């Protein structure tokens, strides 16, 4: 007989479903940073990669496979066909179009909508019960798009949203105070990037309100210019894009953090993009980052943060802008 | 007073030495994969990045820094100046030239020698007691080069060598047997890549010699073609390079594995590139992969593998070829 | 409304996906529990015992450490409804040896405990894997198989996984090498009658037996037999010194659990139904190297034994069948 | 030659050493938690009971295959503790029937009289992490006997009390304790102070949403959460005879911040003379920044008059006991 059969007596032919499967759709720098972070945190018994670029897809799958000795994730698979994604608990969408010279920003969005038109129904056919974690920008709009196309309930369609913006805020806060970001608390809500809202009232170390110690916190009067911390949350992202061409490491770690809460049913609170119609006087179908409880059914609950009238007004304006763009999209 | 001073009462000024510092020189795909793997395994209290490309360097450092909330490595620093590398326990060189159109292979090696001429003396000035882990290709030759330029004792100059080749071997072994690579034992020794030597006599699951069960193992008459496993160790590396343009994830994980043994003083046995003059009838100053015991002083010991005359001959030929190339290099 | 309802908007009313039960919260069960919690192998840990105060106190002590763990549900009770939907159920329950009590009486008392435990485990987790730790472990694994009616893939004894770990510790002390890099198998019975397979002892795939043919014989000037004597004697020594063993078995069980819960297909020396091998004709469980994954034991490795090694297993099988015939329970 | 020499050609101080003094249930829970978090390259155990000590060391050693801590040693001689970055004291006397509580304290002082100078001789630069009860008093005792600066003498303090608070908070809100923020300060156990003003999820003040929070009028009885912080500890002691797992995990958390220089903020017991109107040499839990030099910095928490009053009373009570102790 074969060497395998001389060495190994088989007890069962059984094939068996994967119990903790994650799919990443889009194997650019962002998708692969999600993949390595997820592999290094042991969140999956099976990792499936999907892309349209066959060579990049196969090469990334093989490079990870060659590291199997150093991992505890026993099955890594890839393909263009969504049958490789079957029975995923969680499917992370990092797929996007590359901006072309001589193209409007609405056209870039529409091109990402058309990608979602192909991706989302295929994901749903093979993993009807999965949670969808949307990373692709524009992330708040494309989370809406994935919800509409999927027909999933809102608990199972999640945008990565302000989880990274909040992590940057805490890094910068930590540098100012000489304290680890874990111990520096502070929330950025609403839109990912330029229009994000820093909730100054929630900024604390050891439950000590910085706003209470320093009432000028987050105003133009402020002698220490704490507003510059939130400006750097937006600008440092543009800075990394200008300096290396894209961001990967921080978003990959952020997504692995959301994946951890979902796969282990932790019910930790993260600022992610959820369907917010009914709150802060928003009457339209838009996704914005508020603090949500993440577990095995996706978003089970969200935290109603006490905002100032000004903070409430910024979210209403964001909802108006997002509904305006959403009405102009073709499904 | 300032918000910091209202919130935080300082007890002590002077900030001491880092106790578990790692430097990565070269922030390409390989250096950054080493960095993320090291960060995700908590092997360092301080990670220093060095490159010549200031924008890429700063951008990569900032991208990692933005992830600090998700890591347990409190200090991430970068610069062109080697003062940022001061007091490193371990310094990983992933710095290399990009092959030019029309450039000869000897010229590419000499250009990497000239990079080492700048890097190594600067590394030594700021971390005179560090272990050097050489990753840059050609890795066996450049480990020799780093030893000569550094003046370090041979215990503290290590090539990543066949640790990755051995991991690929075990991956492929595992696919054939339906067994995790951790439980599939097999050694690839000598040169990294094309001229690596599979030691068929050491291939085992649970201490059961595959060679003893199947004496044709690793010969041309073999009906199961086990030689194809070692062919794929070389060919799969070229395949990933063809498919994505380079390899990163597997080498990053391999280097983090060596770093773990060194930083934690594990005295695990790894196939790494060490100065092998005096063994297997090699009379020249060459570095080849044999199984070494790795700990806090680098290579303390090496394992004397019983080789066939053919296996011994392949290492002698590798030593001759490496000494031939080495005497043609200019310091 | 309530503080909860002012703070949190609920989206959905709330099954565990990765549940582990430990039956018996003695020193052994609790060492298994802390090891499992510290390796993040479960989303739910259930504890069962007959001593309600000890059980509740241990559950509460673990719960109070929740902040430092990533296992969001810890539950206990004497009622097996708390064990419902376990992937894996670890039996560490046992009677305390009395002065003057016969060996057969101790075994029968543990059989009577299994008479209550096993059918209750099966009712609430009909698809679980059973990991039997309670001594005598090879006999009680047989007992659990017969009472459960489970197929043999889903009934596993911890067996010689600990004996093999002790062997490698001792091997490592003699060679100055980490136990991870010291390979050596103890098979057959847990404890006194265990068989060291000298032929499989290797570092880096180098046979110690081939280098030193006296290895494991009485002629041996270095007395390597003393390594296997210490595998048995060091266990008795720890029992004499602290009254019991806990930490090593806890870590060993967490290692098996890791392979099962993550479907790793790593090879461990565990106790499996071995009728049909090495000329054994009776229904006995002995430790051979098994492939562990999500369906329990999928495959065995057929180790090449000497006639002497084969004879020791046959004698063990005869002794175990002799004791098994004298036990009272229904299948 | 020997098999070792046939197999291995030889070519050629611990960097991250932790000592645990006292190998009861508490010391060994600290040890397993530290081993399972990879915080040490060397673990040293010390006790006075030589057989228990040797047995515990051997049991851990037998698990080496499953660990990444390559050297585990024990002995009654403090030479095994040489060059420790961190030394955790879980050593203590067992309460005797009819023995007074001041006598139990003095007996623990006499144990520290032997332990602390030996620890200092072999690891003059170590951080001392004091766990033994009464923890705030015995931290003072270790500081006085050691002559160490206050940055390098740390009590485990309210790190565990704060973890219990967050567990209970989490059960009430259906949220992971990681995401439930709340601080217990001052004395470990009975006289601990819950800072209601800092209780938050996602930076949302529970006090602001529900101003009765932590008053007796409160219809939801949130004070019961802090009552359970104290009572649940007594409950575990009544049910299993002692606590081990939660304190072990808590100490591993402090050790992680110290060994990796994280500068995370923990409620640990530090020398508080000069702060919150305390005028005596006493150790109480306030939020401290922990790193490779021990406590580098304190967070100055804004307390209510009532919270401030509880700490000042604790300082008075602790100084009263401390002036009656014999060195
Ligand atoms: N709330 S929202 O969904 O609508 C939304 C709007 C805009 C952005 C900006 C944006 C884009 C992004 C890409 C593609 C796009 F097409 C758009 C976009 C921009 C503007 C749009 O609306 C219009 N602009 N001009 N005309 C229009 C219109 O359609 O009317 C639409 C899309 C943004 N990516 N991206 C990245 N972030 C990172 C990181 O590391 O944090 C790396 S990249 C960022 C954030 C930037 C770093 C700070 C992120 C968001 F989530
Ligand atoms: N023992 S050695 O140090 O001398 C040595 C020789 C050759 C190589 C081949 C090589 C090179 C490599 C790069 C740059 C170079 F300049 C050379 C090289 C080739 C030939 C050289 O010298 C000559 N020999 N005979 N004539 C000549 C000549 O000078 O023309 C010198 C350098 C190789 N990279 N590289 C990579 N590996 C990976 C991965 O994932 O495993 C990704 S890339 C590989 C391995 C191959 C993919 C499998 C790896 C080695 F380690
Ligand atoms: N293959 S087998 O199932 O039959 C079997 C037999 C004997 C033992 C011995 C044994 C027992 C043990 C307890 C209670 C028992 F009742 C028995 C037992 C053994 C054999 C019996 O056989 C008989 N029944 N009736 N007559 C006989 C007879 O002897 O002829 C009955 C009870 C063992 N515990 N135990 C522990 N190990 C550790 C540790 O850390 O390694 C901690 S404790 C050990 C191992 C010893 C330290 C090295 C472990 C085994 F797995
Ligand atoms: N801040 S302090 O240093 O002064 C101090 C005082 C009292 C205690 C109480 C205490 C003791 C403890 C043991 C021995 C003792 F001797 C004392 C003690 C009590 C009162 C004393 O003072 C007096 N005795 N008689 N009169 C007086 C006086 O007031 O003058 C002295 C010692 C407590 N252990 N212990 C444990 N905790 C746990 C756990 O998991 O949390 C497990 S055990 C606990 C905490 C309680 C379970 C919740 C913990 C502390 F930190
Ligand atoms: N949410 C956040 O905070 C952040 C989001 N991002 C977003 O992540 C996305 C990806 O960024 P990068 O990886 O750098 O981009 P990239 O362009 O490198 O990769 C996107 C990938 O999507 C693939 N793709 C396109 N159409 C596809 C289809 N139909 N099916 C499958 N795959 C398809 C492409 O082939 C490509 O590999 C972008 O939208 C980016 O803005 C980036 C950083 C942070
Ligand atoms: N030993 C092994 O098993 C493997 C080794 N490698 C080697 O790793 C090296 C890097 O690979 P990639 O990341 O793909 O290359 P890359 O070309 O993307 O990056 C190398 C980096 O070195 C930098 N550099 C050049 N001169 C420098 C100097 N004087 N000081 C500091 N930095 C300097 C460059 O700026 C560049 O960022 C290559 O030599 C490659 O062959 C890669 C695969 C496996
Ligand atoms: N397989 C191995 O390598 C090893 C096995 N062991 C075995 O582990 C077992 C436990 O060891 P220790 O924890 O030291 O024992 P222990 O006597 O301290 O605790 C055993 C626990 O079983 C509980 N128990 C008894 N009847 C029960 C029932 N009907 N349902 C549920 N729980 C029940 C007891 O109440 C007790 O809490 C022993 O049989 C021992 O021989 C221990 C060492 C190594
Ligand atoms: N700070 C906190 O939050 C908590 C503190 N603890 C404290 O932990 C301590 C230990 O608790 P257990 O392990 O249950 O106690 P235990 O009495 O079982 O163990 C204490 C050990 O100290 C040893 N010891 C006594 N004198 C010694 C000396 N001169 N040198 C070295 N070792 C010596 C004893 O031999 C014994 O093994 C107690 O003080 C307890 O109150 C307990 C839980 C929580």
Overview of the structural elements:
Four copies of one chain form a homotetramer. Chain A has two domains: 21-159, Rossmann fold; 162-328, Alpha-Beta Complex (L-2-Hydroxyisocaproate Dehydrogenase, Chain A, domain 2), CATH 3.90.110.10. Chain A is 41% helix and 18% strand. The first copy, chain A, contains ten helices and 15 strands. Chain A has helices at residues 3-7, 29-40, 54-66, 105-126, 139-150, 163-177, 210-213, 227-244, 249-263, 309-327, and strands spanning 8-10, 21-25, 46-50, 75-78, 90-93, 131-134, 157-159, 184-185, 188-189, 197-198, 204-205, 208-209, 268-275, 287-295, 298-303. Chain A has a six-stranded parallel sheet, with helices on both faces. In chain A, α4 (105-126) links the parallel β5 and β6. Chain A is globular. Chains C and D meet through α1, α2, α3, α6 and α8 of C and α1, α2, α3, α6 and α8 of D. β1 (8-10) of chain A pairs antiparallel with β14 (296-301) of chain C.
CATH superfamily of the largest domain in chain A: Lactate dehydrogenase/glycoside hydrolase, family 4, C-terminal
Largest interface chains and counts: C-D, 67 and 67 residues
Q: Strand fraction band of chain A?
A: 15-25%
Summarize the helix and strand pattern of chain A as letters: HEEHEHEEHEHEHEEEEEHHHEEEH
Which assembly state applies to the chains in this document?
homotetramer
Helical proportion of chain A, percent range: 40-55%
């Amino acid at each position: 007989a074969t060497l395998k059969d001389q060495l190994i007596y088989n007890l069962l032919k059984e094939e068996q479903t994967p119990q903790n499967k994650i799919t990443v759709v889009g194997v650019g720098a962002v998708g692969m940073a999600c993949a390595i972070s997820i592999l290094m945190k042991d969140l999956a018994d099976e990792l499936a990669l999907v892309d349209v670029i066959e060579d990049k897809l196969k090469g990334e799958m093989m490079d990870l496979q060659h590291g199997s000795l150093f991992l505890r994730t026993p099955k890594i698979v890839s393909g263009k066909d969504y049958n490789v994604t079957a029975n995923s608990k969680l499917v992370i969408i990092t797929a996007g179009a590359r901006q072309q010279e001589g193209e409007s920003r609405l056209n870039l969005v529409q091109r990402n909508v058309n990608i979602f038109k192909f991706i989302i129904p295929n994901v749903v056919k093979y993993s009807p019960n999965c949670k969808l974690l949307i990373v692709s920008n524009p992330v708040d709009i494309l989370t809406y798009v994935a919800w509409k196309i999927s027909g999933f309930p809102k608990n199972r369609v999640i945008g990565s949203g302000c989880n990274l913006d909040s992590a940057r805020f805490r890094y910068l806060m930590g540098e100012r105070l000489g304290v680890h970001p874990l111990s520096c608390h502070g929330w950025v809500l609403g839109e990912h990037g330029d229009s994000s809202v820093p909730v100054w009232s929630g900024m604390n170390v050891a439950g000590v309100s910085l706003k209470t110690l320093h009432p000028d916190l987050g105003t133009d009067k402020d002698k220490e210019q704490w507003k510059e911390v939130h400006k750097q949350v937006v600008e440092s992202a543009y800075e990394v894009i200008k300096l290396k061409g894209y961001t990967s490491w921080a978003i990959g770690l952020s997504v692995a953090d959301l994946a951890e809460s979902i796969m282990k049913n932790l019910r930790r609170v993260h600022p992610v993009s959820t369907m917010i119609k009914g709150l802060y006087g928003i009457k339209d179908d838009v996704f914005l980052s508020v603090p949500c409880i993440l577990g095995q059914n996706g978003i089970s609950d969200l935290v109603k943060v006490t905002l100032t009238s000004e903070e409430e007004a910024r979210l209403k304006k964001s909802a108006d802008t997002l509904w305006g763009i959403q009405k102009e999209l073709q499904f």
